[PDB]
């Protein structure tokens, strides 16, 4: 019953998601400077293609605050395939259980917006 608070970054290229130190955290006016830390989780979807065979769709990366989402128990910097970490300078390395996850039944997803001067890899 839980989803990301933001819309996804679609991976159109061959390279995985990666942000330079300090960049990557989506803008949220309902959050404070201490909360600006989390991870992007890759979600690949498979569909029945025009030839009957299963084919992959462009991967989607969803942001979740630290201590929240499908990898709530993972600490910052944890090595896991499909998980990349982001944190703004000044955010505290503590769980963000007060923000948590979004319930789509009563909350719309916030359009993913990166701060001014955020660099994204090719195909994003």
Author numbering: 48 to 171
Paper text:
All crystal structures of nat_mutants with WT-like RNA-binding (nat_mutants P67S, A119S, E136D and P151S) superimpose well with the NTD WT with RMSD values between 0.592 and 1.776 Å. Mutated residues in the above-named nat_mutants lie peripheral to the structural core, which further supports both the converging structures and the unaltered apparent RNA-binding affinities. The effects are moderate and may be neglectable in the full-viral context, which is in line with earlier findings using P80R (and A119S) variants of N testing the infectiousness of virus-like SARS-CoV-2 particles, where no significant effect was observed.
One central protein involved in the formation of regulatory ribonucleoprotein complexes (RNP) is the coronaviral structural protein nucleocapsid (N). N plays a major role in RNA genome replication, translation, and packaging and has further been found to interfere with host-integrated stress responses and stress granule formation. The N-NTD possesses a peculiar, hand-like three-dimensional fold, with a β-sheet palm and several flexible loops, arranged as fingers around the central β-sheet. The latter, together with the extraordinarily long basic β-hairpin finger, constitutes the positively charged primary RNA-binding surface.
